[PDB]
């Protein structure tokens, strides 16, 4: 169906321990395909998905030049933000940037993204119009003014509507056997007595791609949102993801509970019960 490409930049200062580290990673949907790390013995852009390996040496050198120049500029930016906030030269700080493009099931540009954070708090964002900025505070307004003066948004728009979309479509074709394949969850329900009159029902979803999934428990057809323990979706390490949802139920009432699974890889939404 729908698809996205995202780059994630993390720049981390560390006073007394060298220059700020810059890390860039690229994803198509829930698949990482590239990395760069300024701390590596020989910093270079590296493949992280098999379908990107076919790209020529000019691709890899272009990426490396981009990430190397960004490394330098992010170090300047970290110094700038430390100043904007009147911060001591003694603390470690982090700039993060996420950007990229979304496609619909056509797939044409649905929307572009470009957002930054400082120390884990939203700092500045490109608006959906790809023309204007939202600044979080007076410090970010300084960043806004110099991006407005340098016509940054104009460059962002040209990239997000052009090359971002073009290369995403290219990756989606080159990696179609995985990127355009949804693996449904493998599901089952476990039962764990906790006491004489309560037991845990745990609904498992395993081996699914992409990570987007809904697991819900119902009692008599009514969702148990407040009583459902829901873990964060977690990677298996083989491209696939895992999740569970659990409810503590009165013993003997197990059959009044149904687990419901929604995933794009499923022919139909699933309804599961405990099978003694």
């Amino acid at each position: 169906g729908s698809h996205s490409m995202r780059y994630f930049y993390t720049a981390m200062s560390r006073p007394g321990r060298g220059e700020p580290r810059f890390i860039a990673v690229g994803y198509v949907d829930d698949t990482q395909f590239v990395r760069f790390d300024s701390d590596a013995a020989s910093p270079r852009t590296e493949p992280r998905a098999p379908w990107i390996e076919q790209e020529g040496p000019e691709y890899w050198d272009r990426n490396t030049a981009i990430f190397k120049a960004n490394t330098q500029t992010y170090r300047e930016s970290l110094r700038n933000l430390r100043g904007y906030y009147n911060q001591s030269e003694a603390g470690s700080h982090i700039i993060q940037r996420m950007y990229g493009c979304d496609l619909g099931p056509d797939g044409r540009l649905l929307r572009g993204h470009d957002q930054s954070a400082y120390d884990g708090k939203d700092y500045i964002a490109l608006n959906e119009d790809l023309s204007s900025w939202t600044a979080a505070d007076t410090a970010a307004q300084i960043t806004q003014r110099k991006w407005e003066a340098a016509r940054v948004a104009e460059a962002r728009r040209a990239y997000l509507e052009g090359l971002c979309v073009e290369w995403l479509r290219r990756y989606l074709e080159n990696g179609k056997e995985t990127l355009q394949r949804a693996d449904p969850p493998k599901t089952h329900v476990t039962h764990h007595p906790v006491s004489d009159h309560e037991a845990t029902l745990r609904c498992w979803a395993l081996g699914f791609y992409p990570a987007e999934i809904t697991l819900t428990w119902q009692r008599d057809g009514e969702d148990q949102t407040q009583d459902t323990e829901l873990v964060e979706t977690r990677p298996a390490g083989d491209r696939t993801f895992q999740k569970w949802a659990a409810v503590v139920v009165p013993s003997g009432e197990e059959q009044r509970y149904t687990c419901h699974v929604q995933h794009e890889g499923l022919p139909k939404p699933l309804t599961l019960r405990w099978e003694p």
Partner: peptide
């Protein structure tokens, strides 16, 4: 593919 470098220099924050 990441955002290519502009003609001049990258604009810092």
């Amino acid at each position: 593919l990441p955002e290519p470098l502009p003609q001049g220099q990258l604009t810092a924050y």
